[PDB]
Amino acid sequence: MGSMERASLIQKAKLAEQAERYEDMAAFMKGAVEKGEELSCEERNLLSVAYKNVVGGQRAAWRVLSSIEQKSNGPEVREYREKVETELQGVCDTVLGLLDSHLIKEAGDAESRVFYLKMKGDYYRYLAEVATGDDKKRIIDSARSAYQEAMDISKKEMPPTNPIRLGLALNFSVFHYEIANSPEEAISLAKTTFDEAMADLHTLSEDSYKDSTLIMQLLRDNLTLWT
């Protein structure tokens, strides 16, 4: 995308989302990041939406294939699961590479830095879902470390109802439950996040209230599933 203007890449990413062309969306946003400038709030959301949808489809396909493979236990199911797995790992590596070169290091405001560190935690989490053995350990720790740094900044710099802070806590709680084998930590984090947000809703406008309560309901939905 080196020959396309930054503004044209952003415009085409928005069109790609409307057309449900998420692979295109992700390619346009990768090209925009590679222009080297920082991303605005809206541009960060386009980047995240694009790759979350691409990797979300890969994850769903990997889970279908992994289920068939486990029931089976010729080489074809394993070979095809491996193919999908390699593709998924490649997309995660691409996103992590954008964050490392150089989105995180240039992000100084709490909103941007937390957003990118939450993404870093998420893409290491997706790598951990398909990892085995000792590789799993260092990948799991990388996710943990990114989420922890994001949590530390969010608790110092953002109110407890901030939607980025809430979504980070939601995703880190999923990490604890599904990856780290720490269901009690997951439940504790979701409960404390929910309760601290509840106590701060009185400060918010109608539109901010709607955003914060939407994510609080996601925390509650997980707590209902886990308890």
Binding site: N45, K52, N53, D122, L170, V174, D211, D221, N222, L225
Partner: peptide, 9 residues
């Protein structure tokens, strides 16, 4: 369980 969606919908 569920993680954050890409958009509010």
């Amino acid at each position: 369980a569920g993680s954050i969606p890409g958009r509010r919908s």
